[PDB]
Amino acid sequence: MQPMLNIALRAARSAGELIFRSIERLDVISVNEKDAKDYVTEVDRAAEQTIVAALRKAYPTHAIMGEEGGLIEGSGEGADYLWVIDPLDGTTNFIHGVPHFAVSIACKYKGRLEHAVVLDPVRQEEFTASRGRGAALNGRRLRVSGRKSLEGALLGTGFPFRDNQIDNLDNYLNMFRSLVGQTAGIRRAGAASLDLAYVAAGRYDAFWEFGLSEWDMAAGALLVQEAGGLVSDFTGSHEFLEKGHIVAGNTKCFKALLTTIQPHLPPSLK
Amino acid sequence: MQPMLNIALRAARSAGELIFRSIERLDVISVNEKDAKDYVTEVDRAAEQTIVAALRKAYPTHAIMGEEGGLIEGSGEGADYLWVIDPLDGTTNFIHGVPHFAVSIACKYKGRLEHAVVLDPVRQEEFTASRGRGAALNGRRLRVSGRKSLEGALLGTGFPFRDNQIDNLDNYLNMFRSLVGQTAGIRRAGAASLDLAYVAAGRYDAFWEFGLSEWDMAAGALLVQEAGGLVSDFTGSHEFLEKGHIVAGNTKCFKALLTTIQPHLPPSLK
Ligand SMILES: O=C(O)c1cc(O)c(O)c(O)c1
Ligand SMILES: O=C(O)c1cc(O)c(O)c(O)c1
């Protein structure tokens, strides 16, 4: 891999080790729900510090973006590079003790995905990719599935909003209803980055979600493109990071899933 | 532990080793669609034989009822024991290469759940219980969560039915709609056994599903009861194993989920 992807990978590993070590005290701390959520914010910030420290040791002039910290611009040539970091994808799973969550690290050069790490530290699954270098899971070269249609497909989605609102719920369930009929299953495991990784690995045949922020999609999107898959927003265009709505799949199941949800979209998602 | 639970646990381990070894040859699947389902049948039958050989080595007079093999009756005093086995719960996940599935073994004495093992061989998480001894995860005592209401709750569910048409999905989504309300999330992960285990561990606050077979509910239902939790069918009665509909939770989330679904059941599930 590129030295840059190796540094992203090593960062993701250190953060995942700290997050992994952090899940034990939760069931002990879980008795105070608000104090438990405060603790998870603190674990997330410790994970962000671990990632940023490792990245900035190799590239102190790069720009960095996170949910909480926002955009910190670079300097010189480094102004062109942007690290998009989600230190813990699947915070609801994490607070409940559900072992399915991940560190997510993307590197963008002039707005285009260059490098991606999605790291499951419980299963110790390291998903990696660089633009034009392909995708891998623990060093095994990854490829999207061969499935030709939604019949007998396994699809993923989520509902990533921090409150259950009826407009988002109605539109979400409209699409869900329309998408059940044929599939071998529909999966809601609760971490967008792992869903996109699973499409890249051939474990899922397609994935769709709206309401996502860039840090939840960026790495998974490169994994899927480098796996020979397709990624778009709900209009079929390439602004999934900016719009928050994404369809990702193998080529055929991507097209069928994108076409299937259009009749159910409000103009908001068009 | 009791020798009988130890034998259950050892059998679950050997089947998990075989299923784990069987996931590597998949190369995250998509070989031939038709060949893949047959492979799953082969893996499941090999695993059921591995479990049954350990069960009959220790207890040759016990009755045994498997997902593959169906019901084989016992003899003498052994006739009082029924082993209810799913050698691989989460077959659709397994065939796609999604690493979330479990071996599930219950033992019933005179109609009553007596022993339970649910084993996740990827995360190597061994959930165990005997009537009156409590439940454990890798030997560590389990207790259902403290959450007092469905507000910020995490729910588990699934809908394995695929009819020619969307009627049965409609009734399922009637229940789903009524249950979203104030919840933090719902999960659709593909293995009922692990969802009931997750209620028993405090990882889910409650769970509901209909169309389930006994071998997928039996072990998880004892895990929940021994974790201080509640199990019933969709009417609030205790015919979940026979009817295929089940609600499991901590005290308050079990009651609130039971209350919320009552108006939304079809006469099918009364
Ligand atoms: O219940 C859901 O719709 C759901 C809940 C979540 O908290 C979540 O992250 C997800 O991806 C889906
Ligand atoms: O078919 C099943 O055993 C099943 C299907 C699901 O959609 C699901 O979430 C689950 O826990 C189990």
Which chain A residues in 187-226 lie under 8 Å from chain B, judged by CB atoms? Answer: 187-190, 198, 201-205
**Contact (CB, 8 A) for A262 and A242:** no
For chain A, give the longest Cα–Cα distance.
53
* Rounded distance between C-alpha atoms, residue B161 and residue B213, angstroms: 12
* Rounded distance between C-alpha atoms, residue A106 and residue B262, angstroms: 46
**Contact (CB, 8 A) for B175 and B264:** yes
Is A80 annotated to bind a ligand? Reply is no
**Nearest residue to B152 (alpha-carbon basis) of A188, A95, A26:** A95
Kindly give the interhelix angle for B3-24 and B33-58, rounded to the nearest 10 degrees. Answer: 160
Copy the structure tokens of residue B37: 């389902």
Parallel/antiparallel/unpaired status of strands A154-156 and A81-89: unpaired
Q: Which chain A residues are Cβ-neighbours of B203 within 8 angstroms? A: 96-99
Kindly give the interhelix angle for A166-180 and B167-180, rounded to the nearest 10 degrees. Answer: 150
Parallel/antiparallel/unpaired status of strands B185-187 and B154-156: parallel
Sheet holding B206-209, edge to edge: B185-187, B154-156, B206-209, B246-249, B230-232
Residues 6+ apart with CB under 8 A from A4: A58, A59, A107, A114, A115, A130
**Contact (CB, 8 A) for B166 and A181:** yes
* Rounded distance between C-alpha atoms, residue A235 and residue A243, angstroms: 10
- Quick check: do A3-141 and A154-265 share a fold? no
Query: Which own/partner contact pairs does B34-43 have at CB distance under 8 Å and 24+ positions apart?
Result: B36/B95, B37/B95, B39/B95, B40/B88, B40/B91, B40/B94, B40/B95, B41/B68, B43/B18, B43/B19, B43/B88, B43/B94
Nearest CA distance, B22 vs chain A (angstrom): 15
* Rounded distance between C-alpha atoms, residue B200 and residue B157, angstroms: 15
* Other beta carbons less than 10 A from residue A115's beta carbon: 27
Copy the structure tokens of residue B124: 């190597």
**Contact (CB, 8 A) for A51 and A105:** yes
Backbone angles phi, psi at A136, to 5 degrees: -150, 155
Is A67 annotated to bind a ligand? Reply is yes
Parallel/antiparallel/unpaired status of strands A154-156 and A206-209: parallel
- B3-141 CATH fold: Fructose-1,6-Bisphosphatase; Chain A, domain 1 (3.30.540)
**Contact (CB, 8 A) for B129 and B110:** no
Residue type present at position B211? G
Q: Which chain A residues are Cβ-neighbours of B122 within 8 angstroms? A: 123
Which experimental approach was used here? X-ray
Quote the radius of gyration of chain B (alpha carbons, Å): 18
Torsion, Cα A242 A243 A249 A253, to 10 degrees, reads -150
**Contact (CB, 8 A) for B229 and B254:** yes
Torsion, Cα A205 A210 A216 A222, to 10 degrees, reads 50
Give the angle subtended at the CA of B170 by the CAs of B165 and B171, to the nearest 5°: 120
> What's the Cα-to-Cα distance from B160 to each of A184, B163, B190, rounded to whole Å?
8, 10, 9
Nearest CA distance, B13 vs chain A (angstrom): 18
**Nearest residue to A84 (alpha-carbon basis) of A60, A59, A51, A57:** A51
* Rounded distance between C-alpha atoms, residue B175 and residue B263, angstroms: 9
Q: How far is CA B229 from the centre of its chain?
A: 15
* Rounded distance between C-alpha atoms, residue A22 and residue A46, angstroms: 10
* Rounded distance between C-alpha atoms, residue B88 and residue B47, angstroms: 7
Give the angle subtended at the CA of A181 by the CAs of A180 and A185, to the nearest 5°: 50
Copy the structure tokens of residue B76: 């003498």
**Ramachandran quadrant class, A211 (left: phi over 0; alpha: psi -120 to 50; beta: rest):** left
Residue type present at position B214? E
The secondary structure of chain B as a DSSP string is --HHHHHHHHHHHHHHHHHHHHHHTTSSS-S-HHHHHHHHHHHHHHHHHHHHHHHHHH-TTSEEEETTTEEE---GGGGGEEEEEEEEE-HHHHHHT-S--EEEEEEEETTEEEEEEEEETTTTEEEEEETTTEEEETTEE-------SSTT-EEE-------SSSHHHHHHHHHHHHHHTT-SEEEB-S-HHHHHHHHHHTSSSEEEESS--HHHHHHHHHHHHHTT-EEE-TTSSS-HHHHS-EEEESHHHHHHHHHHHGGG--GGG-
Q: Which chain A residues are Cβ-neighbours of B92 within 8 angstroms? A: 154, 184-185
The upper half-sphere exposure of residue A150, i.e. CA atoms within 13 Å in the direction of its Cβ, equals 21
* Rounded distance between C-alpha atoms, residue A23 and residue A95, angstroms: 8
Full 3-state SS string of chain A: CCHHHHHHHHHHHHHHHHHHHHCHHHHHHCCCHHHHHHHHHHHHHHHHHHHHHHHHHHCCCCEEEECCCEEECCCHHHHHEEEEEEEEECHHHHHHCCCCCEEEEEEEECCEEEEEEEEECCCCEEEEEECCCEEEECCEECCCCCCCCCCCCEEECCCCCCCCCHHHHHHHHHHHHHHHCCCCEEEECCCHHHHHHHHHHCCCCEEEECCCCHHHHHHHHHHHHHCCCEEECCCCCCCHHHHCCEEEECHHHHHHHHHHHHHHCCHHHC
B128: which strand partners? B117, B136
Closest residue by Cα to atom 1, ligand 2, is: B160
Torsion, Cα A50 A222 A122 B94, to 10 degrees, reads 180
* Rounded distance between C-alpha atoms, residue B114 and residue A97, angstroms: 27
Backbone angles phi, psi at A197, to 5 degrees: -55, -40
Kindly give the interhelix angle for B192-201 and B214-226, rounded to the nearest 10 degrees. Answer: 0
Overall resolution, Å: 2.2
Copy the structure tokens of residue B61: 């007079």
Which residues sit with their C-beta closer than 6 Å to ligand 1? A 92, 158-160, 188, 190; B 184-186
* Rounded distance between C-alpha atoms, residue A243 and residue A213, angstroms: 8
**Contact (CB, 8 A) for B158 and A187:** no
* Other beta carbons less than 10 A from residue B80's beta carbon: 15
Is B56 annotated to bind a ligand? Reply is no
Q: Which residue of B has its CA nearest to A177?
A: B169
Copy the structure tokens of residue A140: 């095994």
Which chain B residues in 172-191 lie under 8 Å from chain A, judged by CB atoms? Answer: 173, 176-177, 180-190
Cβ contact, residue pair A203, B96, below 8 Å: yes
**Contact (CB, 8 A) for B128 and B135:** yes
> What's the Cα-to-Cα distance from A64 to each of A60, A61, A236, B93, B261, rounded to whole Å?
10, 10, 28, 36, 47
**Contact (CB, 8 A) for A83 and A196:** no
Burial zone of B49 (CB within 10 Å; 0-12 exposed, 13-18 middle, 19+ buried): middle
**Nearest residue to B151 (alpha-carbon basis) of B262, B260, B234:** B260
Is B88 annotated to bind a ligand? Reply is yes
Domain A154-265, CATH among 3.40.50.261, 2.60.120.1030, 3.40.190.80, 1.10.340.30? 3.40.190.80
- For chain B, the structural domain boundaries read 3-141, 154-269
Assigned CATH class of B154-269: alpha beta
